[PDB]
Design a protein around this ligand. Structure first.
Ligand SMILES: [Mg+2]
Length: 496
């Protein structure tokens, strides 16, 4: 068979995560398809949530220590909002990995900023990689992060970094429990355009994982109102919600409602990196010892590994709902669970038409999770029509500037400024005393008006969002400015 790097990963992972080895048949075939692969591979691994898909990411990384003919490292891309301190906490404690790491964990927007030759330095803090070329020599795995095509303000950019990435024949693995026919079509398009070896691996009808999960009885319900109406002390409770301000307010009251205040916890992305690390430590500990109440945003749906007896969720598109369902009865001997979707919840970042279409389509065809047969039809029907709002000319220019070595960030920013800009989603580093928090340009203005932000090396006093967008323009150009937080960082609530 001649694949020891896969065995080495399956053993070291099964020890640090304390589970006894299982088969996981698709993963070995997926590993072999990438390594042999006469032509550059474009694998779409479409497996249910909680399958163990991240094992292939660890396997291909160990394989890079022994052979780098196809790729010298594994770049592992998580969705934009997601929290990456969990997988980093596993790539460190299990495998012990400007320095070349065999496995790098970036996020969806940071990835496209790098391919556009923009500055992402403080996000990478030594540093793992800081260069567009370090990406092109690697194998990039999109872990539930291709859903940036669903973000209206991000379609043109991320479509350009898919056209450019395939134009360089970079090996690409796409991991998703939610693969619409519309997405498989765009990926097969650029895979066929650049002579890849396209492939889609989804489990068989006799797959042991899906059989084991059908023995699980987990009901899903609908309701309205305050999510604290449905908490159940004595069980593991999780309330996942569509915005951070909403998550802080639910936690501000769940402090005093839950029987043991010690077992209440808030997690979201507007926190320092070390604070997230501490919460992952406190959360792995509670996973073995009794009950708790976890309150979080979408950030914990992709990156964090936890199982919860009862799940209370805002209404959301089917992609993030399937992700959030995946943390109810996730482990082996967990057979009973409960899900309650709040259909009256605020949308937040999500498009309104999409969240209502999943809510309707779900109610007709009652689904049970981790069984793609039930939710696959809703997936293909909601996540479509991407090409409506693609700037086909700006997309052509971005792929032009990315291909040209003599074009740097000023050429990318000025060309984008002519077709303030997409910059609205370019998060900027807010400096908390020692750590750092990524915030939006809009959030920077709100904090400057409250007189909590001090900007060194920059003159304009920030009002009128266009001014805040200009600070992001400076950070992207790598200018010697520091956006510093003056107030006291709340070690529980994060940044407002
Ligand atoms: Mg994952």
């Amino acid at each position: 068979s001649h694949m020891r790097a896969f065995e080495d990963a399956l053993q070291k992972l099964a020890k640090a995560k304390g589970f006894k080895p299982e088969r996981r048949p698709l993963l070995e075939g997926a590993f072999h398809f990438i390594t042999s692969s006469e032509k550059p591979p474009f694998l779409i691994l479409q497996a249910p949530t909680g399958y163990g898909k991240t094992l292939l990411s660890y396997a291909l990384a160990v394989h890079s220590l022994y052979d780098a003919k196809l790729f010298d490292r594994i770049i592992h891309v998580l969705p934009m909002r997601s929290i990456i301190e969990d997988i980093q906490k596993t790539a460190e404690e299990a495998f012990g990995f400007l320095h070349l790491f065999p496995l790098n964990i970036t996020t969806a927007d940071t990835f496209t900023w790098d391919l556009l030759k923009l500055n992402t330095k403080r996000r990478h803090r030594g540093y793992d990689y800081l260069t567009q070329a370090s990406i092109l020599t690697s194998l990039v795995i999109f872990d539930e992060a291709h859903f940036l095509l669903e973000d209206k303000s991000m379609v043109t950019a991320f479509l350009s970094v898919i056209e450019f990435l395939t134009s360089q024949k970079v090996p690409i693995v796409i991991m998703t429990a939610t693969l619409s026919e519309a997405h498989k079509k765009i990926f097969k398009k650029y895979a066929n355009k650049n002579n890849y070896n396209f492939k889609v691996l989804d489990p068989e009808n006799d797959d042991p994982f899906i059989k084991r999960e059908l023995k699980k009885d987990i009901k899903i319900e609908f309701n309205r109102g305050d999510p604290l109406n449905f908490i159940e002390p004595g069980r593991r409770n999780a309330i996942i919600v569509n915005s951070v301000k909403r998550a802080v307010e639910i936690f501000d009251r769940a402090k005093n409602i839950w029987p043991e205040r010690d077992r209440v916890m808030l997690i979201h992305g507007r926190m320092t990196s070390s604070h997230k690390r501490d919460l992952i430590n406190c959360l792995r500990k509670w996973q073995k010892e009794g009950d708790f109440l976890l309150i979080g945003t979408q950030a914990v749906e992709a990156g964090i590994d936890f199982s919860v007896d009862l799940m209370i969720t805002d209404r959301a598109p089917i992609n993030s709902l399937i992700q959030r369902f995946g943390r109810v009865a996730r482990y082996k001997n967990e057979k009973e669970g409960e899900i309650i979707i709040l259909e009256d919840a605020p949308y937040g970042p999500y498009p309104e038409d999409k969240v209502e279409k999943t809510l309707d389509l779900m109610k007709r065809g009652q689904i049970l999770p981790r069984i793609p047969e039930t939710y696959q039809t809703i997936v293909t029907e909601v996540h479509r029509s991407i090409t409506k709002n693609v700037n086909r000319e700006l997309k052509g220019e971005l792929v032009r500037l990315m291909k040209d070595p003599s074009k740097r960030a000023p050429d990318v920013l000025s060309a984008v400024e002519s077709l303030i800009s997409i910059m609205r989603d370019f998060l900027i580093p807010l400096l908390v005393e020692d750590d750092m928090v990524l915030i939006t340009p809009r959030k920077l203005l709100e904090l400057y008006s409250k007189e909590l932000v001090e900007i060194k090396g920059f003159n304009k006093e920030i009002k009128s969002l266009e001014d805040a967008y200009k600070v992001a323009k400076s950070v992207a150009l790598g200018e010697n400015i520091e956006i510093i937080f003056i107030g006291n960082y709340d070690w529980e609530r994060g940044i407002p």
